[PDB]
Amino acid sequence: GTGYDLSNSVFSPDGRNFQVEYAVKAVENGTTSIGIKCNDGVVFAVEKLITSKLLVPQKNVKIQVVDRHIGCVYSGLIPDGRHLVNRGREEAASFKKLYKTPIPIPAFADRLGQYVQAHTLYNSVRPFGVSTIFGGVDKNGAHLYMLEPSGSYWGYKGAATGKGRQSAKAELEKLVDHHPEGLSAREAVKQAAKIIYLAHEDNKEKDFELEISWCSLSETNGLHKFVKGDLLQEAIDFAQKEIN
Amino acid sequence: QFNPYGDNGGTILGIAGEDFAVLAGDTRNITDYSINSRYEPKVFDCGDNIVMSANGFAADGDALVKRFKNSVKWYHFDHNDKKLSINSAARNIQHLLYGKRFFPYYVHTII
Amino acid sequence: FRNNYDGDTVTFSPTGRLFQVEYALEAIKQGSVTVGLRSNTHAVLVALKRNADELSSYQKKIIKCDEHMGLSLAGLAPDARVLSNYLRQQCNYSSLVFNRKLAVERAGHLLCDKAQKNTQSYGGRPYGVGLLIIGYDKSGAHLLEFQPSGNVTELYGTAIGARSQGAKTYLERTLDTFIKIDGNPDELIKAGVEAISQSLRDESLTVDNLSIAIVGKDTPFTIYDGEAVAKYI
Amino acid sequence: MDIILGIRVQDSVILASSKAVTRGISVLKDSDDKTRQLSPHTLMSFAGEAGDTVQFAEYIQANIQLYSIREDYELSPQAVSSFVRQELAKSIRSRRPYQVNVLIGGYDKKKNKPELYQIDYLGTKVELPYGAHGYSGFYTFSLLDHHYRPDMTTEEGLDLLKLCVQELEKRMPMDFKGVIVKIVDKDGIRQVDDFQAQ
Amino acid sequence: MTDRYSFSLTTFSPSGKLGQIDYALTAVKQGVTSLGIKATNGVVIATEKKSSSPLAMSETLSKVSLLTPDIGAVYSGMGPDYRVLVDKSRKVAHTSYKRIYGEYPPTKLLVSEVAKIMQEATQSGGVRPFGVSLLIAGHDEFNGFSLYQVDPSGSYFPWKATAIGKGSVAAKTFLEKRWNDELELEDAIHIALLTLKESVEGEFNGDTIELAIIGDENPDLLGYTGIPTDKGPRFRKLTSQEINDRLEAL
Amino acid sequence: DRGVSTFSPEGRLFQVEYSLEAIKLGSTAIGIATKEGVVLGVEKRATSPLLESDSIEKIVEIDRHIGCAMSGLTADARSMIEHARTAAVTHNLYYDEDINVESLTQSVCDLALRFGEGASGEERLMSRPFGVALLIAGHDADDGYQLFHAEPSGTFYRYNAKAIGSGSEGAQAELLNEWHSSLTLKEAELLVLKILKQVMEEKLDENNAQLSCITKQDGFKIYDNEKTAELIKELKEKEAAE
Amino acid sequence: AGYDRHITIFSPEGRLYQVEYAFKATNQTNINSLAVRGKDCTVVISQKKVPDKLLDPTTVSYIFCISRTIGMVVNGPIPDARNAALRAKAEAAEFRYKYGYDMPCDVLAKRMANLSQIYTQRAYMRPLGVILTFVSVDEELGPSIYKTDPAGYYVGYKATATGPKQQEITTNLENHFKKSKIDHINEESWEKVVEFAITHMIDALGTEFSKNDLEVGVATKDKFFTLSAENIEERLVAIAEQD
Amino acid sequence: GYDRALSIFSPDGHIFQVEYALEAVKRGTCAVGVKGKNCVVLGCERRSTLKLQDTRITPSKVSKIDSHVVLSFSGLNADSRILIEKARVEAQSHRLTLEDPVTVEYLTRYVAGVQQRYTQSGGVRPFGVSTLIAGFDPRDDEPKLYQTEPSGIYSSWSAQTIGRNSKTVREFLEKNYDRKEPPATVEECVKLTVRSLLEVVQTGAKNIEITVVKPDSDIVALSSEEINQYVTQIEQEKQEQ
Amino acid sequence: GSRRYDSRTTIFSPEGRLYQVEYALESISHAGTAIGIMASDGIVLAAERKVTSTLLEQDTSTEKLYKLNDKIAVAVAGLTADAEILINTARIHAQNYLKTYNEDIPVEILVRRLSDIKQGYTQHGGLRPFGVSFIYAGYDDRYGYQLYTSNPSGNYTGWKAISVGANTSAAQTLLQMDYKDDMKVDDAIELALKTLSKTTDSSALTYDRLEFATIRKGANDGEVYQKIFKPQEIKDILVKTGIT
């Protein structure tokens, strides 16, 4: 029969969960955002569509920090993303409280994973309308991750999601091939600014605002910090230059 | 064993004039035979032309005044910024105090 | 289509839309118009009050949250009472516990999160009201736009309600102008009353029809109604 | 404590209860009726802790009246006393126990015999020819043990009581201000308004 | 989250049928045949171990389970449902009886308990009836040997002999021909093995057949000595070998 | 089916909208506010001649300074009145003063949207909205005489005059022309009595209609039949005098 | 009527469609796996497919270390697979805590099957679209393989296979045991058992494997571990010098 | 845990579950009440779908809530018991706290409130019952007669009927009951009551039970004969014309 | 959400009927017939075992007659399992009463309780009603011998003779025909067997398909005795009443 796509925890005859699949549509419909793992950290970047001149520039921050060493960015329904970060925060605090050490990225990923997957188990809740790219530096290295509405997530070398996800993935694959030895914190910040600009062609209509953040063992001491002022403009230019 | 109460001394005085009123209090705060402060305000202006002092156990006095001030704030929010008459403040404070009838605010309060 | 995916908030449509939330957004549009704009020293709220009969009053559209914060509503009044009340507590909590005035940006995050919990759970319904939050904190004047979808945005100015698009184009045009109306409250208020009358059509703002509010550098959030706004009509 | 006496004669049950209510140093009242009618043919006297005393009595009463109406029937004195005992037995192991002792005097219209029940606050029930709570038995049981006969008439019983009360007024340290006497028989409950000098 | 299914999933239809129970009985019908025969001095329950793959180890899967040392059960229908029912049965036997009276419950009572658990899955909110029919055989001092059948509805009835599942009709018929009130345990085991043969299509040996009995006490299966009154369990699962031995005299 | 707290594509709450339909079927209730007090009148509307009309209670006291009239599913109003009375008494206990009419109304309206099957906002345990509207009339120092209209939507409006019920649109139009800032308690009474007569199916008399008022001096009072029978007579005369 | 296909209640045929559909989801990953028992070890082989180049291959695994002794491989979407793994780990930990000894592989299997059986009966919980294969060298049963499905069913195996081409791998193994006449791989080293596993994985699927096309798990007395691309490469090299 | 909204509004502003609750009342045996000048009489018809009953024990239609108040009803029997129990309990609680038995109006308002609550509470359906509550306030002699319905609405009547064919019997009463002069006698009051039931009972000396309530907890139910005597005297009035 | 699958077992039909109760009754109408006849010196409870087999152990069976108290018993018509749930609570209610008042529970009080429990499943909780109809046969010193009946609706009534289950119409007519107020237990026992015998949907009315019980005040004692006839005792009384 039909109606398989009306309730959240229902399996369709082919084994799918249509509600999760529809949530993905809300993700693909949102802004594009990315993550670039480097030789000792990770860089996060995102497209901030400017609805009008009325939006105060640099104010509506979209990238979020969890604990002191983790960055999270997402595409889709923004409120769902915040909801997910609040949980990540409680999850991180909880882990630190009991184990003393700040939560490992792999560990943090699964906390988010199990929580999101949980929202695909009952028809009394709806799946998350966001794909989240997040990561940071821990006891043994840098880690980049992307979490889908289905609760699925994996470790990435580079990741993208949203409106211009294909452009970005394309650019990322090139970087991966042309830099087998690893990109650098400084470089990835620029490379990120570029990929966002390029990927903006799938939304070229409205003017946008760039936002980057990073977490590098050498550049930020292993803490998550936003890219501002000089280093920011420097990357914006590196992009504006290669978009021509 | 643990004693939740303490005594910070102090003395306060309230006199009702005909078209005025005063509420005084020394500024000495003590613990046993030591002075904690030579100047620790004990009488407060709570808005709507109401002054209050909760003398005795300082922690309790502070909590009570703080709770009453916040009470005045909500009075405004809930009753279209109406002013809180001194008699209405008094009745309100009674309920604040009696709410802890079994773990009293160890203070002698005057408004 | 839609008819099969709008029976509750817990359901996504095939395109990835949340209809119950959109229907909520609609209650806003159907609401009276209100405008918000700020300089670097002040923030102003101007709203058009609507009445039922000529024998009824003009339902208020502005609510104070603390001495430094307040908002204007558009849509379901009760939901604004609930949201403003929650905001009143958060402000209160910030003062009592940390003896700190709540940052407008943070009040926005709190509102966003409260609204979001009503768009992911069964039996609950989205809030059917839009809010314009203004306030002066440790980083200056601020104006926020709150949408029932949980989306909060910081702007120099904006408007919501029926025909709101009028005032919004006006402001987007007047930007460079009003943004500098510092140290001069009356000038920002007039600039605001001009933006709102850009959404008129039915009538013209009268004395018991206009409602204005302001907060700023040395101005505790206060509301003006009737005779008090006469000097702006 | 107060005085709670009960005696079951041939065709009725007599309950004598002191009239004094003392609070500390002063006698607040001297006309208190330490009794509640549980049904047309069942009466209950009580003594004990200051507030629990009437609170319990009235609670038991309300329950019996509710039963009477729901069933359009009157429970036997035995059934009422078992209900009352169970209530006290629950109370004794509760947070704050009802410190009340009671005597239940009723006339069983089905058996056609008067019945007297003694139940203390622990829920200790026993059926007796005559009983009392507190120190009362200490002064009167030797008299009852002597003059009591199962075939006594209501008039003979009131005489034996009068004797008991006289002993109480002689040897007991407290002035309980006389007693109020009530009779329970096939015709309901009635009060002997003349025992002050009968 | 939170189970918001606080209403019944089984309700009466206009005809008066209880759909889910009917459907559950249908699930039982597709199940592999199992049976029980009561002798004058014992009871036998048996079934076929329909292995789902030759790589699977059919011994690691028991269709005949010990509930108490004097009661066993076998079923037809949904295996997984049976498994949890057994855990609950073994537990209720303790919590609602052994921990109270110091002894194991009599067969009818335990059956009564199991039946209750199944009845609840017929009326409680948010669940479906169990898709199984059990056959429970046991012995107790005051009732001797007995055999009961418990259905999805929670209904249970005593039998002298009976079968459930796939070829129950045929098997029940074959049993009415060979049963009498004077069968000895070994006779019933024999009749059981014959009845089961009609239902089995492929291999029919001690590794494809699961069979257990409620007979005499096995002091050798007690684990200790020293207490006269403790004589051992009356329940016993026949070994692969024990079955084949009797298969020759088939 | 469909959640009891669902939005229509127009941004309205179905249950509340349907709630209003029920109110339109209720008896007419009219309120008029003058600087001399507020008058509240209602249509008894007995369903049978055997029904003892004075047992029809559609005008009730909330406190000595607040009264209210109801229209629609009247039974649904008992708990509202109860809540209202408690709210007023409680306020007085906590502040040694009278509760402001507007505040009393706000408290009542807070109940309005507390319905649903598990809405993520608190513990709104009530299966449906109220099927009745209320006219709340009272007096207080800060805003004097007041008339409010509390609906199952949660919103309430202040009116100088207002009619709710089956005859509302008709009666409201009337009040539009008849009301002016200088009315007197006397005028208002006749005016309410008159407009009721126009919209009532029955011939208005002191048995199928009831008046009341609230004055700073004597509080809220419900006019007994006799007192009203006369106000009716006095009306018939003034109308017949042109 | 038509809702007997959305929640776990019986259909008129006495079926549970949702459970059936959950089974369909187990093949979503298009991964095949197989497990065999050695003389004193247990090996689980599973295909590893990393399509996207942007993915960090080291984080793409369907094999889990449940406890020091139990290993679990999953066939089904990763989110449900991780849900099952976390639960299994918690269950194994708690069991050791309450009963004083390591939870046996077959017992954890039964526990997980029981949990699954519940999603089959209670309507608010959906089944998990996964099949769980648990392996270990039990201290009482020796090399062990127990597999559970969305139906709440579980059983022990001599060897087993799961995935889209499950049937080919199964019959391949079946044939091998009909031949050897024993219920295990008569090998002393696990390295050889791992080789046999990879070999027959190839014969049956008719495909060659590089060091990154496989994922291997090995259970031995007191330990379960997974191999590295290089540990596997070493295995691949050895099978190459025989063919 | 079950809280589904069963009583909700429909587009036309109606609450069907409540409305249907009334259909259950229309299907119940008729019940009538008429107040005299010094009493109140309650009459109820007895079904005849099956007869071989044991009238001694079968629950009667009129129930005592307290010694001075009675309640009769039309609709689902099982539902009425739940209301009667709550009523009786409330009557005892009132005496225990106010130290005075309930007034008829109070007891009525209480039952009506219970009914109203079941019209807007999750997980429950309204009561398929309508009641007539009659009696005398403590130390008062003015008769009281009230009626409640599934909606929770109540009010007093000089005379009133509910249930099947109540339409007919109410008409009889509207043109046979003069408020100016109420049945000044317990006898002529009971007569009027029987007369109204005959319009619908269709000869039922055994199908018409009556209860008379007088001041000071004076409640008594008549017997077949006593009633049958009124039936007899009434049929002649017709023929003697 | 869940609402989609809720049957709403406790609502009114537009006619003012309770669907589930109606259907439950329909279900009961197919249950083996059970009869109750009240004599002047006792009461009889007879029931027909619906469906049987040769292998059915009829000695250890008891599917229709249950002892509730020492002076009360019930005859069951409907879902046996459902009946056992109720019987057990009834057994408990009887004892609570005994413990509280030291007197056996008056028959109506026990019947009213079970009925109120049934009535509950009719007005709230969203659960299906119990598909059970009871015939209570009991004695107490207030009304002596009593016969009651309760069905899914939670309604109960008193009778001199009554039937529940299948063909109650034909059965009720036969009872109304031969019943006489002055009957005697043995007369009743015969009426019971005759009635079943004529309404049976089976060939003959053998003993293996019957359950019999009587509540007599055995003259030789002065107290009440409950007797649940044993297979043999039934086979006997079956030959004597000329049904061999």
Short mmCIF file of N, CA and C in Angstrom, two decimals, chain I residues 75-159:
data_model
loop_
_atom_site.label_atom_id
_atom_site.label_comp_id
_atom_site.label_asym_id
_atom_site.label_seq_id
_atom_site.Cartn_x
_atom_site.Cartn_y
_atom_site.Cartn_z
N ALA I 75 -20.84 -18.30 36.68
CA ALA I 75 -20.87 -19.10 35.47
C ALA I 75 -20.33 -18.12 34.41
N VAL I 76 -19.38 -18.58 33.61
CA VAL I 76 -18.76 -17.73 32.59
C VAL I 76 -19.19 -17.96 31.15
N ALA I 77 -19.33 -16.86 30.41
CA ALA I 77 -19.69 -16.91 28.99
C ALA I 77 -18.84 -15.85 28.29
N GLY I 78 -17.86 -16.29 27.51
CA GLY I 78 -17.00 -15.37 26.79
C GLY I 78 -15.55 -15.83 26.81
N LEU I 79 -14.62 -14.87 26.75
CA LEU I 79 -13.19 -15.17 26.77
C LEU I 79 -12.76 -15.68 28.15
N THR I 80 -12.41 -16.95 28.23
CA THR I 80 -11.99 -17.54 29.49
C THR I 80 -10.88 -16.71 30.16
N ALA I 81 -9.82 -16.43 29.42
CA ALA I 81 -8.70 -15.66 29.96
C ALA I 81 -9.16 -14.34 30.57
N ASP I 82 -10.03 -13.61 29.88
CA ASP I 82 -10.54 -12.33 30.41
C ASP I 82 -11.28 -12.56 31.72
N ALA I 83 -12.07 -13.63 31.75
CA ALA I 83 -12.86 -13.95 32.93
C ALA I 83 -11.97 -14.24 34.13
N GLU I 84 -10.86 -14.95 33.91
CA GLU I 84 -9.95 -15.27 35.01
C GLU I 84 -9.36 -14.01 35.63
N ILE I 85 -9.06 -13.00 34.81
CA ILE I 85 -8.53 -11.75 35.36
C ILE I 85 -9.55 -11.17 36.34
N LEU I 86 -10.81 -11.10 35.91
CA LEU I 86 -11.88 -10.56 36.74
C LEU I 86 -12.21 -11.42 37.97
N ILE I 87 -12.25 -12.73 37.76
CA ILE I 87 -12.55 -13.66 38.84
C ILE I 87 -11.54 -13.46 39.95
N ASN I 88 -10.27 -13.39 39.58
CA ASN I 88 -9.22 -13.21 40.57
C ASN I 88 -9.38 -11.91 41.36
N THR I 89 -9.75 -10.81 40.70
CA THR I 89 -9.91 -9.56 41.44
C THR I 89 -11.16 -9.70 42.31
N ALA I 90 -12.16 -10.41 41.81
CA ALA I 90 -13.39 -10.62 42.58
C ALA I 90 -13.07 -11.42 43.84
N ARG I 91 -12.26 -12.47 43.69
CA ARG I 91 -11.86 -13.28 44.82
C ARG I 91 -11.17 -12.41 45.87
N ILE I 92 -10.33 -11.48 45.41
CA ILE I 92 -9.61 -10.58 46.31
C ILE I 92 -10.56 -9.59 46.99
N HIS I 93 -11.51 -9.04 46.24
CA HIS I 93 -12.43 -8.09 46.83
C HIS I 93 -13.22 -8.74 47.96
N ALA I 94 -13.61 -9.99 47.76
CA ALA I 94 -14.38 -10.73 48.75
C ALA I 94 -13.61 -10.82 50.07
N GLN I 95 -12.33 -11.16 49.96
CA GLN I 95 -11.47 -11.28 51.13
C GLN I 95 -11.16 -9.94 51.80
N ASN I 96 -10.99 -8.87 51.03
CA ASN I 96 -10.69 -7.60 51.67
C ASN I 96 -11.86 -7.29 52.56
N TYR I 97 -13.05 -7.57 52.04
CA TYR I 97 -14.29 -7.31 52.76
C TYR I 97 -14.32 -8.13 54.05
N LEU I 98 -13.99 -9.42 53.94
CA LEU I 98 -13.98 -10.31 55.08
C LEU I 98 -12.99 -9.81 56.13
N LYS I 99 -11.80 -9.42 55.70
CA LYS I 99 -10.79 -8.91 56.63
C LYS I 99 -11.25 -7.62 57.29
N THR I 100 -11.87 -6.73 56.52
CA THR I 100 -12.33 -5.47 57.06
C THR I 100 -13.49 -5.57 58.05
N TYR I 101 -14.53 -6.32 57.69
CA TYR I 101 -15.71 -6.43 58.53
C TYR I 101 -15.93 -7.76 59.24
N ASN I 102 -15.04 -8.73 59.03
CA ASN I 102 -15.20 -10.04 59.66
C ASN I 102 -16.56 -10.66 59.37
N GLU I 103 -17.03 -10.44 58.15
CA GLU I 103 -18.30 -10.98 57.68
C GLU I 103 -18.13 -11.23 56.18
N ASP I 104 -18.79 -12.28 55.67
CA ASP I 104 -18.70 -12.60 54.26
C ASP I 104 -19.37 -11.50 53.47
N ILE I 105 -18.81 -11.23 52.30
CA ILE I 105 -19.33 -10.17 51.47
C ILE I 105 -20.73 -10.42 50.91
N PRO I 106 -21.65 -9.48 51.14
CA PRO I 106 -23.02 -9.60 50.63
C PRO I 106 -22.92 -9.71 49.12
N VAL I 107 -23.60 -10.69 48.54
CA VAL I 107 -23.56 -10.93 47.10
C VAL I 107 -23.64 -9.70 46.19
N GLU I 108 -24.61 -8.82 46.40
CA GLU I 108 -24.70 -7.67 45.51
C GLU I 108 -23.48 -6.78 45.57
N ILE I 109 -22.92 -6.60 46.76
CA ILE I 109 -21.74 -5.75 46.90
C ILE I 109 -20.57 -6.28 46.05
N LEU I 110 -20.43 -7.60 45.96
CA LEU I 110 -19.35 -8.17 45.16
C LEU I 110 -19.65 -8.02 43.67
N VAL I 111 -20.91 -8.22 43.30
CA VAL I 111 -21.33 -8.10 41.92
C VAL I 111 -21.19 -6.66 41.45
N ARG I 112 -21.62 -5.71 42.27
CA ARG I 112 -21.54 -4.31 41.89
C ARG I 112 -20.09 -3.87 41.65
N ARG I 113 -19.17 -4.40 42.44
CA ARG I 113 -17.76 -4.06 42.30
C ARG I 113 -17.22 -4.53 40.95
N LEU I 114 -17.41 -5.81 40.65
CA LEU I 114 -16.93 -6.34 39.38
C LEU I 114 -17.54 -5.58 38.22
N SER I 115 -18.81 -5.20 38.36
CA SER I 115 -19.50 -4.47 37.31
C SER I 115 -18.91 -3.07 37.14
N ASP I 116 -18.55 -2.44 38.25
CA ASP I 116 -17.96 -1.12 38.18
C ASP I 116 -16.60 -1.19 37.49
N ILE I 117 -15.89 -2.30 37.69
CA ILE I 117 -14.59 -2.47 37.06
C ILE I 117 -14.79 -2.57 35.56
N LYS I 118 -15.83 -3.30 35.16
CA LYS I 118 -16.14 -3.47 33.74
C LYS I 118 -16.59 -2.13 33.16
N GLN I 119 -17.40 -1.41 33.93
CA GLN I 119 -17.90 -0.12 33.48
C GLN I 119 -16.74 0.83 33.20
N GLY I 120 -15.68 0.70 33.99
CA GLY I 120 -14.51 1.55 33.82
C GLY I 120 -13.90 1.43 32.44
N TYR I 121 -13.66 0.19 32.01
CA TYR I 121 -13.07 -0.06 30.69
C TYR I 121 -13.96 0.47 29.58
N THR I 122 -15.11 0.99 29.97
CA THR I 122 -16.11 1.51 29.05
C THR I 122 -16.06 3.03 28.92
N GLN I 123 -15.51 3.70 29.92
CA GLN I 123 -15.50 5.14 29.91
C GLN I 123 -14.15 5.81 29.84
N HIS I 124 -13.08 5.07 30.11
CA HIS I 124 -11.76 5.67 30.06
C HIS I 124 -10.62 4.66 29.93
N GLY I 125 -9.44 5.15 29.55
CA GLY I 125 -8.29 4.27 29.42
C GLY I 125 -7.99 3.77 28.02
N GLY I 126 -8.94 3.95 27.10
CA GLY I 126 -8.73 3.51 25.74
C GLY I 126 -8.39 2.04 25.53
N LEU I 127 -8.86 1.16 26.42
CA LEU I 127 -8.59 -0.28 26.29
C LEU I 127 -9.88 -1.01 25.91
N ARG I 128 -9.74 -2.18 25.29
CA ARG I 128 -10.93 -2.95 24.90
C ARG I 128 -11.61 -3.48 26.16
N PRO I 129 -12.95 -3.60 26.14
CA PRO I 129 -13.67 -4.10 27.31
C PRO I 129 -13.37 -5.58 27.46
N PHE I 130 -13.84 -6.19 28.54
CA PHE I 130 -13.63 -7.63 28.73
C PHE I 130 -14.76 -8.35 28.01
N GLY I 131 -14.41 -9.33 27.17
CA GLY I 131 -15.43 -10.08 26.46
C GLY I 131 -16.00 -11.17 27.37
N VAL I 132 -16.62 -10.74 28.46
CA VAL I 132 -17.16 -11.67 29.45
C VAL I 132 -18.53 -11.28 29.99
N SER I 133 -19.36 -12.29 30.20
CA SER I 133 -20.68 -12.11 30.79
C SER I 133 -20.72 -13.12 31.93
N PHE I 134 -21.11 -12.65 33.10
CA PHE I 134 -21.16 -13.50 34.29
C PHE I 134 -22.57 -13.73 34.80
N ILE I 135 -22.76 -14.90 35.41
CA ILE I 135 -24.01 -15.23 36.07
C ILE I 135 -23.49 -15.52 37.47
N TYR I 136 -23.90 -14.72 38.44
CA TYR I 136 -23.46 -14.92 39.82
C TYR I 136 -24.53 -15.66 40.60
N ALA I 137 -24.13 -16.74 41.25
CA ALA I 137 -25.05 -17.50 42.07
C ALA I 137 -24.47 -17.42 43.48
N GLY I 138 -25.24 -16.89 44.41
CA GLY I 138 -24.74 -16.79 45.76
C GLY I 138 -25.77 -16.63 46.85
N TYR I 139 -25.30 -16.68 48.09
CA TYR I 139 -26.17 -16.55 49.24
C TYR I 139 -25.56 -15.74 50.37
N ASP I 140 -26.40 -14.93 51.01
CA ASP I 140 -25.98 -14.15 52.16
C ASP I 140 -27.20 -14.03 53.05
N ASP I 141 -26.99 -13.69 54.32
CA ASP I 141 -28.09 -13.60 55.28
C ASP I 141 -28.96 -12.35 55.20
N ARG I 142 -28.90 -11.63 54.08
CA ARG I 142 -29.74 -10.45 53.94
C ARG I 142 -30.80 -10.65 52.86
N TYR I 143 -30.42 -11.35 51.80
CA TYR I 143 -31.33 -11.62 50.70
C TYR I 143 -31.37 -13.11 50.39
N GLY I 144 -30.72 -13.91 51.22
CA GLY I 144 -30.71 -15.34 50.97
C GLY I 144 -30.14 -15.65 49.60
N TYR I 145 -30.80 -16.55 48.89
CA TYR I 145 -30.34 -16.95 47.57
C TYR I 145 -30.56 -15.85 46.54
N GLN I 146 -29.50 -15.57 45.78
CA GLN I 146 -29.56 -14.54 44.75
C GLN I 146 -28.91 -14.99 43.46
N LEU I 147 -29.39 -14.43 42.35
CA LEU I 147 -28.87 -14.74 41.03
C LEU I 147 -28.72 -13.43 40.28
N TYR I 148 -27.49 -13.15 39.83
CA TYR I 148 -27.20 -11.92 39.10
C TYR I 148 -26.52 -12.20 37.79
N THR I 149 -26.40 -11.15 37.00
CA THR I 149 -25.77 -11.25 35.70
C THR I 149 -25.12 -9.90 35.35
N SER I 150 -23.91 -9.95 34.81
CA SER I 150 -23.21 -8.74 34.40
C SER I 150 -22.56 -8.98 33.03
N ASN I 151 -22.60 -7.97 32.17
CA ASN I 151 -22.04 -8.07 30.83
C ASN I 151 -20.98 -6.99 30.60
N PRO I 152 -20.30 -7.00 29.44
CA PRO I 152 -19.27 -6.01 29.12
C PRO I 152 -19.59 -4.54 29.44
N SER I 153 -20.85 -4.15 29.33
CA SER I 153 -21.24 -2.77 29.60
C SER I 153 -21.04 -2.36 31.05
N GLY I 154 -21.00 -3.35 31.94
CA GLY I 154 -20.81 -3.05 33.35
C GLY I 154 -22.14 -2.92 34.06
N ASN I 155 -23.20 -3.34 33.37
CA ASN I 155 -24.54 -3.29 33.91
C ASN I 155 -24.85 -4.67 34.52
N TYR I 156 -25.63 -4.70 35.59
CA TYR I 156 -25.98 -5.97 36.20
C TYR I 156 -27.43 -5.99 36.63
N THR I 157 -28.00 -7.19 36.70
CA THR I 157 -29.40 -7.35 37.08
C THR I 157 -29.65 -8.66 37.81
N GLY I 158 -30.77 -8.70 38.53
CA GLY I 158 -31.15 -9.88 39.29
C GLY I 158 -32.18 -10.74 38.58
N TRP I 159 -32.12 -12.05 38.80
CA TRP I 159 -33.04 -12.96 38.13
C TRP I 159 -33.46 -14.15 38.97
#
